[PDB]
């Protein structure tokens, strides 16, 4: 009964796919720097979001 | 292959049913347990 559903290793749905890395350091790597800052990743980079 | 035994009525998209009664399998994606349904259709208006 552990977690219910499971995935391919190659789909971008598995926890250890690079999607899931990705989100992992965009909601680190978000809050870095002040939002009025100019290396604020959002403003640098606002289609990643 | 069990996992396949879908479609265990006539059609897989617009199923059989007879004096507004349809019978079909539903199955749970997680568990695999399959229930026989039977959906009653009952006209309140016009159906024409």
Do not use: C, W
């Amino acid at each position: 009964g552990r977690a219910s559903q499971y995935v391919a290793p190659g789909t971008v749905s598995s926890m250890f796919s690079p999607a899931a890395y990705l989100t992992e350091l965009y909601r680190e790597a978000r809050n870095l720097h002040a939002s009025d800052s100019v290396y604020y990743l959002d403003t640098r980079r606002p289609d990643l979001k | 292959e069990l996992s396949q035994f879908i479609g265990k009525a006539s059609n897989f998209g617009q199923q059989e049913y007879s004096n507004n009664q349809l019978i079909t399998p539903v199955v749970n994606s997680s568990d695999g347990t399959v229930k026989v349904y039977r959906i009653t259709r009952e006209y309140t208006t016009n159906a024409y």
